[PDB]
């Protein structure tokens, strides 16, 4: 009869608590679900249940407690995974098999932080030697701690940092793209800010 | 077991009617059209629990809705506007069978103004910086994708002719390239690492392959310029000595 879920957007470290709310209301006996959606664009049952018990484990690692005297169903995994990175959907029914219309909460993204060990953050131009004029700026190695700000010029684009994984070498790496088309410019100044005094050139 | 929409994104203009379909191998009573939208979640447009039937859902507005046979449902939009562009989620599910909701894959329906402003994406690679290499012995090609319009982009690296899922990650969302502009067009960049030796082998072959969903061929233009179809635009590499 009705579902929500408090924070829309979680951000949380490798190997940190998960936590994502839900609360329902229900004139009628309730029963709850997760599910999970990735970039791969259908939603999937991450768990749900009968009431055959209180504590429900669900798929990659999740449990939640159907508390019913709190009118919750809070999903978490003691430790996050880089691959949890994920929108997550709480939702409600009154079938017990979700059979009949469910109804879905708004929604959480949950962003998980790499942690980075040995950070060496650098700035490197990389070109396509016969791409005509057009060049790029690769700011990579940073620790987790760093945050990459908007552009304050025109023909200046700057992308937001994303993590890599080179899972052959226990190796990942965050990395973020600049470039202009103005003749006049260099990768030497097109980061200035949250940047760190030992940046490699 | 498949839930299967007719189109996996799709363009249309202002004021046009737009038909989406749905389909069902599982002899399905319940079938359920929703759609998706940022910080809304999930929100239930119009379902049908029997053949010929149709109820409104939470949100039928500018909606109508059609089931004819039992294994398919359709979404029609009134009128477009932009407001109806969105995710459109649809899902069957059986009355007896335990089972829940069986989703399909969605349709990415984005509307639009005015159609001269739909464009195809230019595609380019950048090779690993020496510098990187030299300090690090990886090595991090750059893809970039630009001057695309609308949002409808599947970027993907091959190594030899072989798909990676490894050493890679690319632009959770795009930027727009004129930010003033309402109907500004996009950007996009991927990354992809390997070991230098890797980079220092030119059997190796790098490719980059941006997927891209524009108009389909019933519809119509006389601009100068290519029908900005549905397409994948690529960029080439070679591994260095």
């Known amino acids: 009869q009705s579902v929500t879920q408090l924070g829309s957007h979680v951000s949380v470290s490798e190997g940190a608590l998960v936590l994502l709310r839900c609360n329902y209301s229900?004139?009628?006996?309730?029963?709850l679900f997760w599910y999970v959606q990735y970039p791969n664009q259908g939603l999937q049952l991450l768990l749900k249940y009968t009431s055959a018990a209180t504590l429900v484990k669900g798929i990659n690692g999740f449990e939640a407690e159907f508390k019913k005297s709190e009118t919750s169903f809070h999903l978490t995994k003691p430790s996050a995974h880089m691959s949890d990175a994920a929108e997550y959907f709480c939702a409600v029914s009154e079938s017990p098999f979700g059979n009949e219309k469910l109804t879905f909460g708004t929604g959480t993204r949950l962003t998980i932080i790499p942690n980075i060990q040995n950070p060496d953050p650098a700035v490197y131009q990389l070109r396509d030697s016969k791409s005509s004029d057009k060049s790029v700026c690769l700011f990579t190695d940073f620790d987790s701690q760093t945050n990459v700000s908007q552009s304050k010029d025109s023909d200046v684009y700057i992308t937001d940092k994303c993590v890599l994984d080179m899972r052959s070498m226990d190796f990942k790496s965050n990395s973020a793209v600049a470039w202009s088309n103005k003749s006049d410019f260099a990768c030497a100044n097109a980061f200035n800010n949250s940047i760190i005094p030992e940046d490699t050139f | 077991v498949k839930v299967t929409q007719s189109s996996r994104y799709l363009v249309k203009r202002t004021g046009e009617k737009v038909f989406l379909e749905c389909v069902q191998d599982?002899?399905?009573?319940?079938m359920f059209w929703y759609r998706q939208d940022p910080g809304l979640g999930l929100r239930l447009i119009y379902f049908?629990?029997?053949?010929?039937?149709?109820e409104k859902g939470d949100i039928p507005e500018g909606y109508s809705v059609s089931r004819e046979k039992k294994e398919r449902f359709s979404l029609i939009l009134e009128s477009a506007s932009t407001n109806q562009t969105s995710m459109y989620l649809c899902?069957?599910?059986?009355?007896?069978?335990?089972?829940?909701?069986?989703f399909g894959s969605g349709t990415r329906l984005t509307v639009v103004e005015d159609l001269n402003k739909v464009f195809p994406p230019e595609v380019a690679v950048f090779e690993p910086s020496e510098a990187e290499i030299s300090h690090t012995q990886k090595a991090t090609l750059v893809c970039l994708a630009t001057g695309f319009f609308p949002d409808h982009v599947e970027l993907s690296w091959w190594v030899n002719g072989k798909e990676v899922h490894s050493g890679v990650c690319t632009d959770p969302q795009p930027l727009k390239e004129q930010p003033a502009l309402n109907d500004s067009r996009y950007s996009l960049s991927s990354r992809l690492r390997v070991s230098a030796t890797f980079w220092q082998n030119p059997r190796n072959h790098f490719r980059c392959q941006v997927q891209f969903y524009g108009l389909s061929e019933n519809d119509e233009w006389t601009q100068d310029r290519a029908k900005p179809v549905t397409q994948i635009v690529s960029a080439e590499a070679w591994g260095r000595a």
């Open positions: 049908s629990y029997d053949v010929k039937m149709k």
């Open positions: 229900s004139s009628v006996p309730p029963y």
């Open positions: 899902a069957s599910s059986s009355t007896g069978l335990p089972y829940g909701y069986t």
């Open positions: 599982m002899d399905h009573e319940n």
